[PDB]
Design an enzyme around this catalytic site. Sequence first.
Site, short mmCIF file in Angstrom:
data_model
loop_
_atom_site.label_atom_id
_atom_site.label_comp_id
_atom_site.label_asym_id
_atom_site.label_seq_id
_atom_site.Cartn_x
_atom_site.Cartn_y
_atom_site.Cartn_z
N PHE A 46 3.50 2.50 11.23
CA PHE A 46 2.34 1.46 10.90
C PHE A 46 2.96 0.68 12.91
CE2 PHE A 46 -0.24 -0.48 8.20
CZ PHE A 46 -0.15 0.21 7.30
N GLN A 56 -6.85 -13.11 9.67
CA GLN A 56 -6.68 -12.79 10.40
C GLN A 56 -7.58 -11.00 10.43
OE1 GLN A 56 -4.17 -7.96 8.76
NE2 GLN A 56 -3.07 -9.08 10.75
N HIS A 106 -8.11 -7.00 11.05
CA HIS A 106 -7.60 -5.58 11.13
C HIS A 106 -8.65 -5.23 12.14
CE1 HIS A 106 -6.85 -1.74 9.99
NE2 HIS A 106 -5.93 -1.98 8.94
N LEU A 138 -12.27 -1.41 4.65
CA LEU A 138 -10.88 -0.96 5.72
C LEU A 138 -10.81 0.01 5.85
CD1 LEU A 138 -8.25 -1.94 6.96
CD2 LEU A 138 -7.23 -1.96 4.43
N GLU A 189 -3.97 1.51 8.81
CA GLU A 189 -3.74 1.47 10.77
C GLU A 189 -3.20 2.49 10.04
OE1 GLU A 189 -0.21 -1.28 11.68
OE2 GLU A 189 -2.61 -2.48 12.30
N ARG A 216 -1.88 -5.98 15.59
CA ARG A 216 -3.66 -6.13 15.23
C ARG A 216 -4.20 -6.88 15.19
NH1 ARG A 216 -3.26 -4.76 7.82
NH2 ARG A 216 -2.66 -2.96 7.82
N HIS A 235 -9.80 -9.19 7.61
CA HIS A 235 -9.31 -8.82 6.19
C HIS A 235 -7.78 -9.41 5.28
CE1 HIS A 235 -7.27 -5.06 4.94
NE2 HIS A 235 -5.76 -5.33 6.10
N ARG A 240 0.15 -11.09 10.69
CA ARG A 240 0.79 -10.22 9.92
C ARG A 240 0.41 -8.11 10.21
NH1 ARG A 240 -0.26 -6.29 5.89
NH2 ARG A 240 -2.37 -7.20 5.99
C1 LIG Z 1 -8.45 -6.15 0.83
C2 LIG Z 1 -7.44 -5.24 1.70
C3 LIG Z 1 -6.15 -6.20 2.21
C4 LIG Z 1 -4.71 -4.97 2.08
C5 LIG Z 1 -5.20 -3.54 2.33
C6 LIG Z 1 -6.58 -2.86 2.22
C7 LIG Z 1 -7.51 -3.68 1.58
C8 LIG Z 1 -9.12 -3.35 1.62
N1 LIG Z 1 -4.38 -2.72 2.24
C9 LIG Z 1 -3.49 -3.38 2.14
C10 LIG Z 1 -1.73 -2.42 3.23
O1 LIG Z 1 -1.71 -1.29 2.43
N2 LIG Z 1 -0.81 -3.23 3.77
C11 LIG Z 1 -0.11 -4.31 2.82
O2 LIG Z 1 1.18 -4.90 3.18
N3 LIG Z 1 -1.21 -5.06 2.56
C12 LIG Z 1 -2.36 -4.78 2.82
N4 LIG Z 1 -3.75 -5.28 2.24
C13 LIG Z 1 -3.49 -7.21 2.29
C14 LIG Z 1 -2.95 -7.31 0.91
O3 LIG Z 1 -3.66 -6.66 0.01
C15 LIG Z 1 -2.73 -8.86 0.02
O4 LIG Z 1 -2.64 -9.51 0.78
C16 LIG Z 1 -2.68 -8.21 -1.21
O5 LIG Z 1 -3.22 -7.59 -2.53
C17 LIG Z 1 -2.46 -10.00 -2.24
O6 LIG Z 1 -2.58 -9.27 -3.39
P1 LIG Z 1 -1.92 -11.22 -4.09
O7 LIG Z 1 -1.63 -10.43 -5.19
O8 LIG Z 1 -1.13 -11.48 -3.49
O9 LIG Z 1 -3.89 -10.85 -4.87
P2 LIG Z 1 -4.99 -10.03 -4.93
O10 LIG Z 1 -4.78 -9.46 -5.49
O11 LIG Z 1 -5.51 -10.97 -3.89
O12 LIG Z 1 -5.14 -11.08 -6.08
C18 LIG Z 1 -5.13 -12.34 -7.02
C19 LIG Z 1 -5.53 -12.44 -7.95
O13 LIG Z 1 -5.71 -13.97 -8.28
C20 LIG Z 1 -6.83 -13.66 -9.34
N5 LIG Z 1 -7.59 -14.68 -9.40
C21 LIG Z 1 -8.13 -15.57 -8.50
N6 LIG Z 1 -9.26 -16.00 -8.49
C22 LIG Z 1 -8.41 -16.49 -9.53
C23 LIG Z 1 -9.39 -17.33 -10.20
N7 LIG Z 1 -9.83 -19.07 -9.74
N8 LIG Z 1 -8.85 -18.02 -12.15
C24 LIG Z 1 -7.39 -17.15 -12.49
N9 LIG Z 1 -7.50 -16.02 -11.83
C25 LIG Z 1 -7.73 -15.75 -10.31
C26 LIG Z 1 -7.05 -12.78 -9.32
O14 LIG Z 1 -7.74 -11.97 -11.21
C27 LIG Z 1 -5.89 -11.36 -9.42
O15 LIG Z 1 -5.66 -11.16 -10.38
#
Ligand SMILES: *Cc1cc2c(cc1C)nc1c(=O)[nH]c(=O)nc-1n2C[C@H](O)[C@H](O)[C@H](O)COP(=O)(O)OP(=O)(O)OC[C@H]1O[C@@H](n2cnc3c(N)ncnc32)[C@H](O)[C@@H]1O
Lengths: 242, 139, 614, 102
Positions: C123, C244, C246, C256, C259, C290, C357, C401
């Site tokens: 990566f 960031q 991507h 996306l 990578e 990135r 991203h 990142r």
């Molecule tokens: C967009 C993206 C990001 C990504 C990726 C591919 C895409 C298309 N691929 C990655 C990869 O292969 N390897 C890697 O390390 N990172 C990759 N990324 C970035 C990464 O996925 C994100 O940084 C990571 O998924 C973050 O997830 P996290 O656990 O921090 O949360 P989330 O998935 O975004 O989910 C948010 C949760 O919070 C809840 N939420 C949000 N707002 C509220 C409110 N207002 N009230 C109650 N709950 C809330 C959501 O429901 C969810 O469960």
Amino acid sequence: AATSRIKKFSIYRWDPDKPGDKPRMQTYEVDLNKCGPMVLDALIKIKNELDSTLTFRRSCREGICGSCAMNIAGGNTLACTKKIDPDLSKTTKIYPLPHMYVVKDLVPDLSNFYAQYKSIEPYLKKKDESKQGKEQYLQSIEDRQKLDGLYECILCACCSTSCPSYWWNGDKYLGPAVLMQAYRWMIDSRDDYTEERLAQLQDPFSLYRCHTIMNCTRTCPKGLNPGKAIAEIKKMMATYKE
Amino acid sequence: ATTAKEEMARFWEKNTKSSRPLSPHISIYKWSLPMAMSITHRGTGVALSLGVSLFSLAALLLPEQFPHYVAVVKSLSLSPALIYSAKFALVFPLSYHTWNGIRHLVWDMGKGFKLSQVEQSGVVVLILTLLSSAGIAAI
Amino acid sequence: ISTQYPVVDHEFDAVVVGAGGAGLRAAFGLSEAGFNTACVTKLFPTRSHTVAAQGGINAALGNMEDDNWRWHFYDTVKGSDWLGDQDAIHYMTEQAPAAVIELENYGMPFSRTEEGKIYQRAFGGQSLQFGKGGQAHRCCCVADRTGHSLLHTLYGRSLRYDTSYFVEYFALDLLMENGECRGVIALCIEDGTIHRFRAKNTVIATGGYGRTYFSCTSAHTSTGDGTAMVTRAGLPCQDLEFVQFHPTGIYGAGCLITEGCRGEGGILINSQGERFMERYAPVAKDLASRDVVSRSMTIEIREGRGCGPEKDHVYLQLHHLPPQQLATRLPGISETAMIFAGVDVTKEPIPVLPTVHYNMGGIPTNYKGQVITHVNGEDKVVPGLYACGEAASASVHGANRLGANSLLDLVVFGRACALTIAETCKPGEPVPSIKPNAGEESVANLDKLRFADGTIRTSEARLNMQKTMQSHAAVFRTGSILQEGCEKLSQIYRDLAHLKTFDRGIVWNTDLVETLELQNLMLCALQTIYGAEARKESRGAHAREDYKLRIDEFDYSKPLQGQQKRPFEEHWRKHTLSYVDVKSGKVTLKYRPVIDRTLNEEDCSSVPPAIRSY
Amino acid sequence: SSKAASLHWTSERAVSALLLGLLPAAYLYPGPAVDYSLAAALTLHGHWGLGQVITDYVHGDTPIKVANTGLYVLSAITFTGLCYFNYYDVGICKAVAMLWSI
Ligand SMILES: *Cc1cc2c(cc1C)nc1c(=O)[nH]c(=O)nc-1n2C[C@H](O)[C@H](O)[C@H](O)COP(=O)(O)OP(=O)(O)OC[C@H]1O[C@@H](n2cnc3c(N)ncnc32)[C@H](O)[C@@H]1O
Ligand SMILES: CCCCCCO[C@@H]1O[C@H](CO)[C@@H](O)[C@H](O)[C@H]1O
Ligand code: SF4
Ligand code: F3S
Ligand code: FES
């Protein structure tokens, strides 16, 4: 720009907050020249530009999250990956997943579906769990391959809400979604509860309400074949020993 | 937390006493040959069974024995056309249900699940049904 | 003020907010450790953006070649362009192997090597021997669907504990009292009720806010809700200007294209058939960081070598690779390419372009997952508040990142949060009280938007914000342009008093929910573009063409021998801390030092700033 | 038996396969032996099958109990009447042949 292509959409509507409201179909006209290629693109455009009261689920917008599953042109699919039909002579009908309690508009109450999934214990179970976390379990390329076509499921519920058996006995029949997953764990070379997983389906409904209608496989947005997984389960169901 | 059984129970409890409508299904769902041949397999099985049950009933309830009824019909010297039409109509259900039943037995062996093979097996079933009926109604 | 909205109070030992990869891990980690835990999420867990993650999750397992977590530590520290807290990065990378082995033991269907072990791919920016021994292969993965599997595996695992979930509940604000968090208040979307979850500890794992931009890879649901509730609690958010982009979001849809494509042998190509990265990063080429790859692609385009009818994007070529490899390692993007670009990656290149991203910045925590405030020069942890996942800023990513480091982040700090609350508290301890009208202001705001009948509809405002961030805060930035954006932005924010909603119900009113997300989004965008304008230096993802150099406490390009160390106030190697007067929309900044010590210098040596090139 | 549900599914298939074989057997070796086998096979298959139907479309503890009860009657009667025909009349094979003579 200038020179539209107005497409009509008839979408199901029901407000649980309008006392004594009745489901009704509302029609929307959209210019496909100022809209993304996908039905979700159309749904968003409508909420954003004509009726922000049109409610529905969405998140990912690329068909991996499973949120936007609904019935489009009589079939269950994900709005975010289903091309809008370019034939301006047709009004595309959009309904919620079939035979579901409608919470609001195109939003179905999926809790029974979720509970059914929980009921098959979709998680790795080893007899000796005393060594959890010390080393990667070993799985051959060949055994990891048997998981392909099973792990990809996004729990969208299109297949289960397309199966008439689940329409009539959804309270007891687990459905293609959950059953394929139950099979997903039965054949994980790392799981030690295959026999117990089958045991749980020894009743007239959980599994045996599948009479091979194959709507499930046809409707799957990920090209998965729940119908076939179900048949492999039956073969195991009828060969395993206590 | 709530156990799965608990969740299912409150799901029904909540919703059955709600003012939530049931989204439509059979009235709005798009058909396919597979789907249609599937329920037809059901209608035919049932009809064959109701047919076999009407036959046994008649064997226990009608004054006369089979040969007499056959004669009765031959004494109407009916148009072969009608004869053939009836025979055909008699054996179609059985033929459809038999071939398609073999299809189901193949599926039970776990073969023919690619959606495109389901469409194939079905069409084969339909042609074999049509051929066997015609053949038989002609015998 | 009148309770037109009924209120339901809950009492737990702990409240986790968010159910993506971090939240889930935090929530059952807590339950596992005995705490009566509530997990509040606006989405059914598997719908979380995490499920869309593709390429993988890093860990020095050494299944492909011999490895060293310390080498991973270095790659991350270097990757962050020295804006990353090394104690956190130390924790994160040393824990990786165990954290990944834990996911596999949970059943994550990782891809396998010939030896039955977790297959890892190369990566961007990972090396062996602290940058001296070549390309690293430590991205453990599930084909190109690692996020989907990771999230399903974790959700399935959580089904084994007594955690109480409140699905499709939208968290509005924190329940703050005397600088301590008492819980959170929320809107239950299914039935229109208000709920106050009192707990001794609150964890915020609400994800990023890529939707502040017009074009992102993020889900419509990544609206920085928790980041926003911090702001409104009066707490600072950190490094928000570090966005960031991507390298390869697909042209048009924005989805996306991992990578992992480049990791498996894919190459970027301009409108002239050139593999330009061999020119911008002679060594790493397509596997540079990135921020680098994204800038490089950007120049190629504005310089006129972009592809397509509008010469506005470039090509990701994969067709030179064997078809079985694409099918086995990149099945996900192969389909996505077809669906959203009509591309058959075995024959033609995928049109791509740098796309917003991930968010490096977030709610600032220490490496234990505890949220910190910074008063009079010292870090103080806010009692009862933790944060993990992209919603945080531990910060293990600093200014940039390394791909596959977030999914790692999520599970490490989500567990850290759990381990920490555990060593710090005891289950059952008396839950802290809250004043009878605590949260009354959230309902106010909620009811105010529900009936808004102004002149500017949400979708209109939002788009105004997205388009402003898109052209005023992109790959390359400049003071005049950033200054313009800051004002347009503050205009839009002031203009929210002119908002018009139409849906007047409360059950599943996503008209209202998305307006709350607009308030939330704007709080984030403001802090992002203002922090950007103030940061007069080029570091990682933040590239100022009017301040093209990175500014540290010493000029590390020359011997420190007899160098007047620059004062804190005169160099930029520090974290931005933003604050916002909710009422006005006035952004306030401060800075805190970057943590350079590791958790044990003998075990892992702190790594000093240096020139950063690939 | 813990494996009741799967034992039935198997038996069900086994019987269809049985009934399938009697079709050729009734045309190549018509007579008592086959006539009774058909009586047995047709009754059982039609019974299990009608039961799947009830199972799918009949709900409520009572309605089910009922439907099933009356099915059990329909079936014993059917098997009985088919056996009557085979004993006191021409029997299934010969009958078909005669019907197929009109
Ligand atoms: C967009 C993206 C990001 C990504 C990726 C591919 C895409 C298309 N691929 C990655 C990869 O292969 N390897 C890697 O390390 N990172 C990759 N990324 C970035 C990464 O996925 C994100 O940084 C990571 O998924 C973050 O997830 P996290 O656990 O921090 O949360 P989330 O998935 O975004 O989910 C948010 C949760 O919070 C809840 N939420 C949000 N707002 C509220 C409110 N207002 N009230 C109650 N709950 C809330 C959501 O429901 C969810 O469960
Ligand atoms: C009771 C309604 C009769 C409809 C029978 C055939 O229906 C057709 O089957 C095809 C093959 O699967 C499909 O591709 C097609 O969309 C469908 O309309
Ligand atoms: S099997 Fe296919 S359709 Fe059914 S849920 Fe999984 S993905 Fe959605
Ligand atoms: S459609 Fe239903 S009947 Fe079985 S094969 Fe699919 S689950
Ligand atoms: S929005 Fe995620 S599947 Fe459609």
